[PDB]
Design a protein around this ligand. Sequence first.
Ligand SMILES: [Ca+2]
Ligand SMILES: [Cu+2]
Ligand SMILES: [Cu+2]
Ligand SMILES: [Zn+2]
Ligand SMILES: [Zn+2]
Lengths: 163, 165
Amino acid sequence: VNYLFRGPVTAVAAIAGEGEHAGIKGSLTFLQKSLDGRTVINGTISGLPEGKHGLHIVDSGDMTKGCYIAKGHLNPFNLSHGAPSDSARHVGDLGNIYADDTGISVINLTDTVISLFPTPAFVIGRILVIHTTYDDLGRGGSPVSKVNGNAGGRLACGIISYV
Amino acid sequence: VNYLFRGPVTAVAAIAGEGEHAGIKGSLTFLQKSLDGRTVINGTISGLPEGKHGLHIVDSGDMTKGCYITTAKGHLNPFNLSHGAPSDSARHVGDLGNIYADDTGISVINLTDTVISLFPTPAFVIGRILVIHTTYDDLGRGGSPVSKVNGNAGGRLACGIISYV
Ligand SMILES: [Ca+2]
Ligand SMILES: [Cu+2]
Ligand SMILES: [Cu+2]
Ligand SMILES: [Zn+2]
Ligand SMILES: [Zn+2]
């Protein structure tokens, strides 16, 4: 067969900011037991400004020019931007994470759309982004609401890679 | 129908060292036109010590602890073969041989490989770490115990995850 389509798949992302945001650091683990199965995401990020931050997988995995410079959420199904719980969403739409006054965000998410297996929703080799502000979940009535949730610039990112 | 199996694929690795090796910086591009096509690898790295350095893809993509882990994972080897040169019959998928850095610390990388894949076939290299070693790969011919394991290329100077463009 192909070992990439087999057994449980474990992935990780090393999250880092740069420049003024060099203090932003964290790691996420992704586990999907089977092709049909949900993906569980767990980890922490530290050094974040207090409040909600959009968490998105973009269509590129290219970190050669750093975090702060293609744009577009991972969207192989050509849908509009939405919340993770919305049917009308990008593959890359993982919603919002929250950091308190400590700057620590605890991430514990379950997703049914992303894949750790090489199906069209494969997220490995793509960049996970933590945005400046909150994702409006396509409900904000901004022009870019249905494009990217109006979550502003990037604070930090990391490539989703195999464990 | 699966876009991951179609068209030409371009992948990239952002290469960085850390600590004393923070001056090592570069990028490699990988381009493969189709399933079973050759993969052309191009790039430049700066800040390297002069001489030959092993260039290998390891079985892990985990950068959470940085490049200089105490994990000693092993070269990407889904076909369960011994370590060799890229042209050798017996080689790991991850065995891309040696790069050369000149006295200015610049390495110009220009390789073509017919084993690795940018498509999700058994030799898929995306989501794994590309490593630049301390010293040269002996291509499994050095008579060391680890020669047939990893080419005795020593520790790591720098690395990066092979990712989609
Ligand atoms: Ca081949
Ligand atoms: Cu976004
Ligand atoms: Cu090696
Ligand atoms: Zn989106
Ligand atoms: Zn090897």
